[PDB]
């Protein structure tokens, strides 16, 4: 969530409250981290060896073994500290969004009315198939669709938006969630969530996964870290017979110190911290993403698919203007529109009557229920209307009414075509109305674009994602909307099966596409798409179909999704490169130090001019401990991602992180050894 | 001397690329399952007569075919070496080999290592030297090229499940690449002075009056195929550098060209089959930069040579010890780097008598897994694991899904790639540790100090990495050494062939994503340097603790 913003990574309270848990991550329940389990077993072995020297054993220098064991334990504490810090930041967000379950009141109406039965029930007793009534000011006790009535809803407690979100019965603005506050008037909603599968429970399942699933990239990186651990363990453990033939063999504690300094302890300790911090940053960008696998798979998106009515535009779509045709009066046009829009629950159909009756100041006062015969809006039919009398009234798109009038016997006039493409050039969506194979006229449906998103679409162009606009409007109205929004291309006059066909076409080409939608109409297309950024303002069906749902309802939130996904992958690869690159200075510090009595001629490899073998090995272990702490902020923040070319960005990452892993451990080991020599412990 | 060395490297690489590009096209035609021109009809008669119906095989069936051929060859070769006293072409009536020696050389010549812990001219008869140890020289090379054919087919085929016919691949390779080229190579070697006969050993009344017994035998016919198929061997105790095996400098140059011929033509064939020549030129550049750097380092080390030679009254400090006068130290260094980077194993010179750096760099070149124009087939599918590591790391640091040649590289590929890479360093370190912990392995040394450990580590590295070259100061004729090196050679080949075949069978089922704007190009100087850095860094950090107690300690002593 954006508002109620998370504090710094170290607010000096959760540091203590999680280091207390880090002290409880010490025992043998580290079996799931092999790189850290190797360090744990080596630290226990060095502790037992130091205890043996303290109580009487063959070798000496119990203080050196004690210091090595203590610093290996400190390495384990630091690598658990990063993981517990990320996990406790996630738990802090979970506790922030966990107090939403407040109310214990819910009305039980037998029929959806203004009011039927005010039987109060606890909100935990609500199950699927029930209806409630929320007044103007009350909070929502469940998540579900709206049956009757509309009301302005303040979703600040969930999304952070101070601006209220309009919810209206029917259409794509019917889903409402709990914790939000009604600000306008009465509202009757349905109960569509059972206890245990609400939107807040989805949020808690995202942020507080007790068995948090590992992404395939994380598992493959873990496999490579295990392989590096195996080769370093063998190359370190076989050093004892080699030095035994050389003379006096190397001590076991020096071998364990070299083993810990060689294996990738850094990335092996910060991997889970990277994943959990990626979830925390993902929720901090107002996205409720079910799977980190989906988050990381969103990083290679090259084509983004957008809805137009519910995603790029707000979806109010007021019927601003009146346009009559030849031989048609505005009274007849308004009457046909009002009769066609009596029982329509779409926002456009409601807007038709609720402005047209006030504009013309005349109203056909009967309700639709008197001699009722009404047909709903189906998206593939793309046409609706009323046929209460023997005469018929229908409204819909140009293609729908044209097919209807060729079926009836008439024809659509060229004057009507001139008015249609004139209002399409103006930008309003035209709905053609018909009565008895007579085209009365069109209605201008003015719609508003969701702010200045042209800069975000230019950012998407710069990042390499080509965005197209999927809609069902005319070819020219969608062209005007695309010109206003600054998108790359569009596909107009598309039935949802054609949208799904376009998804299959772009997916069979090998491209991994992303789709952003809000409505139930686009729900199977979102479920088919690889990355499906649903909208909170949309429908519960689209929210369930999408693998990640927004809360700010931004059309270009895939920018942030790709940001955190590529930050995860780049942080993993960069810390891996740093960890393998670090071993050169560890070799240059330990090998002339470990082989100093068996082979005294190997001191020429001591290019850092370290004081003594014990100081060199102990300084290497100290740097191996401290690099984890110095890279906790990078693991918890992610690396700095800029929209560069793939080759140039790889070159930048190689330069920065490879040269850091080469030169930085030299400087760190030399500074630590110099500080130790100055202090006098070595 | 530096100008002569640079001219030698440049001439060798230029003639190598010129000779290897048409063979690259020819091998690409066999990868694409297109018969060679003029071989149509003969194939139809021969495959039908044998019982090979050109049915396509999965990775499991392909791998079982390769393993069955190799086990049949192992059994035939082992029983032939045990019963060599009962076979013809024995003009010296040499007895049958012991069980340990016979098992070791059978595993050597089947697993393409061709390690030899005996003296050939006093151990092996003409039948066991020609119908054995040369048939396997053809067969192990053909098996390696068949496995890399399966891997390149896996990279070029989309969404299928089969990998072609292993028997068709082996027959095509042996009859149309391995035989007609090695026939010309053997004929040139006979012209230059190599032996090819079946005469008994020729007694010589020397000029002074002493008597020496010259050994005869079919030398050039085996020499051509051990150079073509990157095999070790030799009729005699000296693998190369025997006058009856490597008579002239032209013969030595042709030997080096034949050693790098098929491993370079395989990169050319891979680049042609993929449709992008940059995909093969990347591998060739990545091999060549490391090869040139290693050749220069070994050349400089051998030119600096023995520091005590000038003190003890000689003319120069050039390390002429253990090298032939018919070549130079420059040519000896180049041949040593060629055979220790190519998993060949033939020695122009006793590597035991090399300097510390000039013994370290060949040893390290074996230890990195033989990827620098490596073993025949095996070099390409060994560097095709470091390429998978490089594309995984680069895909992570660009934020994209890891991807090579369009196909994704997921968890199963990483698991099998790690398992394939782990086999040779694990065997090297365990074999060296077991030889260091055992007096039967420790007592085979000849040179004291760190260099005996260098001998042990070189022997175990060459066995595990299928090189076969030796310092030859190690008395590896012990039963313990024979069994240890046999286990190392066997696991080091057949624990890499199996997971590469599993990688191929999991990669055939994938599809090739087309090139996009954000896809990382797997060619160019950036990726060549990235793959070079990955190879050198992995091969360093695995073996610096092992190399710092041997040749490094000897150099700093």
């Amino acid at each position: 969530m954006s508002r109620k913003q998370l504090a710094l990574f170290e607010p000096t309270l959760v540091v203590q409250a999680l280091k207390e848990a880090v002290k409880k991550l010490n025992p043998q329940a580290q079996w799931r981290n092999p790189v850290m389990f190797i360090v744990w077993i080596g630290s226990l072995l060095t502790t037992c060896i130091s205890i043996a020297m303290a109580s009487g054993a063959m070798p000496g220098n119990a203080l050196f073994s004690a210091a090595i064991s203590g610093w290996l334990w400190i390495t384990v504490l630091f690598a658990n500290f990063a993981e517990a810090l990320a996990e406790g930041r996630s738990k802090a967000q979970a506790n922030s969004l966990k107090g939403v379950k407040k109310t214990a009141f819910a009305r039980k109406l037998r029929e959806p009315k203004y009011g039927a039965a005010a039987d109060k029930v606890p909100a935990d007793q609500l199950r699927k198939g029930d209806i409630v009534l929320v007044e103007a000011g009350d909070i929502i006790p469940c998540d579900g669709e709206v049956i009757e009535g509309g009301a302005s809803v303040d979703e600040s407690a969930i999304t952070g938006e101070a601006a209220p979100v309009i919810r209206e019965s029917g259409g794509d603005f019917a889903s409402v969630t709990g914790g939000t506050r009604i600000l306008s008037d009465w509202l009757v909603i349905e109960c569509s969530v059972n206890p245990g599968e609400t939107f807040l429970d989805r949020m808690i399942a995202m942020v507080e996964g007790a068995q948090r699933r590992k992404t395939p990239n994380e598992i493959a990186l873990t496999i490579l870290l295990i392989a590096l651990t195996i080769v370093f363990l063998l190359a370190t453990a076989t050093l004892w017979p080699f030095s035994a033939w050389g003379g006096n063999a190397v001590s076991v504690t020096v071998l364990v110190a070299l083993l810990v300094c060689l294996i990738p302890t850094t990335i092996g300790g910060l991997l889970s911290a990277i994943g959990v911090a990626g979830m925390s940053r993902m929720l901090g960008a107002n996205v409720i993403a079910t799977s980190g696998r989906a988050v990381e798979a969103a990083g290679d998106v090259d084509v983004l698919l957008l809805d137009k009515t519910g995603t790029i535009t707000l979806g109010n779509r007021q019927a601003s203007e009146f346009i009559p045709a030849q031989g048609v009066d505005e009274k007849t046009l308004a009457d046909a529109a009002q009769l066609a829009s009596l029982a329509d629950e779409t926002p456009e159909g409601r807007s038709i009557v609720i402005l047209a009756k006030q504009r013309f100041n005349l109203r056909e006062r009967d309700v639709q229920s008197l001699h009722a015969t009404f047909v709903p809006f189906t998206a593939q039919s793309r046409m609706s209307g009323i046929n209460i009398d023997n005469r018929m009234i229908r409204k819909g798109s140009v293609d729908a009414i044209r097919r209807h009038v060729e079926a009836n016997g008439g024809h659509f006039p060229t004057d009507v075509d001139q008015k249609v493409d004139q209002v399409a050039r103006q930008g309003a969506t035209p709905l053609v109305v018909v009565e008895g194979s007579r085209v009365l006229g069109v209605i201008a449906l003015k719609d508003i674009v969701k702010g200045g998103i042209k800069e975000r679409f230019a950012q998407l162009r710069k990042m390499g994602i080509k965005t197209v606009m999927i809609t069902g409007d005319n070819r020219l109205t969608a062209a005007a909307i695309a010109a206003e929004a600054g998108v790359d291309d569009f596909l107009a006059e598309a039935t949802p099966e054609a949208k799904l066909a376009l998804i299959r076409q772009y997916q069979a080409e090998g491209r991994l596409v992303a789709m952003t939608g809000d409505g139930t109409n686009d729900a199977p297309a979102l479920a088919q798409a690889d990355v499906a950024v649903a909208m909170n303002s949309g429908t519960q069906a689209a929210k369930e179909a999408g693998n990640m749902v927004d809360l700010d309802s931004n059309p270009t939130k895939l920018i942030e999704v790709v940001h955190i996904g590529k930050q995860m992958l780049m942080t993993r690869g960069s810390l891996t490169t740093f960890s393998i690159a670090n071993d050169v200075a560890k070799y240059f510090a330990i090998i002339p130090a470990a082989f100093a009595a068996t082979y005294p001629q190997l001191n020429a490899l001591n290019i850092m001019c370290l004081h003594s073998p014990d100081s060199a090995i102990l300084s290497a272990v100290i740097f191996n401990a401290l690099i984890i702490v110095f890279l906790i902020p990078l693991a918890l923040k992610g690396v700095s991602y800029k929209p560069l070319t793939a080759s140039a960005m790889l070159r930048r990452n190689l330069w920065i992180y490879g040269l850091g892993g080469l030169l930085v451990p030299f400087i760190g080991i030399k500074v630590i050894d110099l500080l130790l020599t100055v202090c006098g412990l070595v | 001397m530096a100008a002569q060395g640079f001219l030698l490297i440049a001439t060798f690489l230029l003639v190598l690329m010129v000779l290897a590009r048409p063979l690259g096209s020819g091998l690409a035609r066999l990868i694409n399952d297109i018969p060679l021109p003029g071989t149509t009809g003969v194939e139809r008669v021969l495959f039908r007569a044998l019982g090979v119906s050109d049915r396509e095989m999965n990775w499991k069936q392909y791998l079982c075919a390769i393993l069955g051929l190799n086990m049949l060859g192992l059994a035939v070769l082992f029983f032939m070496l045990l019963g060599q006293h009962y076979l013809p072409l024995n003009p010296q009536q040499l007895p049958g080999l012991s069980w340990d020696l016979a098992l070791n050389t059978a595993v050597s010549f089947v697993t393409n290592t061709n390690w030899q812990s005996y003296s050939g001219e006093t151990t092996l008869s003409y039948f066991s030297q020609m119908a054995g140890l040369t048939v396997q020289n053809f067969l192990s090379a053909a098996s390696g090229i068949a496995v890399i054919f399966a891997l390149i087919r896996a990279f070029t085929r989309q969404s299928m499940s089969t990998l072609g016919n292993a028997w068709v691949d082996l027959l095509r390779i042996t009859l149309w690449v391995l035989v007609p080229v090695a026939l010309l190579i053997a004929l040139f070697f006979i012209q230059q002075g190599a032996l090819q006969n079946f005469l008994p050993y020729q007694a010589v009344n020397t000029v002074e009056g002493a008597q020496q017994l010259l050994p005869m035998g079919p030398v050039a016919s085996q020499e051509a195929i051990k150079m073509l198929g990157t095999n070790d061997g030799g009729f005699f105790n000296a693998n190369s550098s025997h006058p009856f095996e490597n008579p002239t400098a032209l013969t030595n140059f042709v030997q080096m060209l034949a050693i790098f011929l098929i491993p370079t033509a395989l990169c050319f064939a891979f680049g042609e089959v993929m449709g992008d020549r940059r995909q093969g030129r990347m591998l060739l550049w990545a091999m060549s930069v490391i090869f040139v750097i290693c050749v220069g380092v070994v050349m400089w080390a051998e030119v600096q040579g023995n520091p005590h030679l000038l003190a003890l009254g000689t003319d120069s400090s050039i390390n002429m010890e253990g090298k032939e006068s018919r070549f130079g130290v420059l040519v000896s260094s180049l041949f040593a780097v060629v055979t220790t980077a190519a998993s060949c194993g033939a020695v122009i010179a006793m590597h035991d008598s090399f300097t510390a750096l000039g013994g370290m760099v060949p040893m390290w070149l074996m230890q990195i897994g033989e990827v620098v124009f490596g073993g025949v087939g095996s070099g390409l599918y060994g560097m095709m694991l470091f390429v998978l590591l490089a594309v995984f790391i680069a895909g992570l640091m660009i934020g994209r899904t890891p991807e090579y040649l369009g196909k994704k590289i997921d968890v199963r590929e990483m698991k099998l790639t790690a398992l394939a890479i782990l086999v040779t360093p694990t065997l090297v370190l365990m074999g060296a540790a077991l030889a260091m912990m055992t007096d039967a392995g420790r007592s085979a040394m000849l040179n004291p100090g760190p260099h005996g450990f260098s001998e042990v580590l070189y022997a175990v590295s060459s066995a595990a990495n299928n090189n076969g070259s030796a310092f030859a100061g190690l008395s590896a004729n012990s039963p313990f050494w024979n069994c240890l090196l046999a286990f190392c050679m066997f696991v080091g080949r057949f624990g890499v062939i199996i997971p590469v075949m599993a990688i191929a069978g999991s990669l055939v089922s994938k599809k090739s994503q087309a090139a996009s704007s954000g896809t990382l190009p797997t060619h160019g100087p950036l990726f060549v340097g990235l793959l070079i850095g990955t190879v050198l860094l992995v091969g360093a950090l695995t073996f610096i603790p092992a190399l710092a107690l041997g040749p490094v300690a000897e150099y700093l002593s």
Binding site: P34, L233 | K415
Partner: peptide, 27 residues
């Protein structure tokens, strides 16, 4: 060989077996 070398080799084989099991599995 004394007990120390046997214990060291046993520990190395146990670590290697655990690491190979971890590489094979998706823990």
């Amino acid at each position: 060989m004394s007990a120390g070398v046997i214990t060291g080799v046993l520990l190395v084989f146990l670590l290697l077996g655990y690491l190979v099991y971890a590489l094979i599995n998706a823990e």
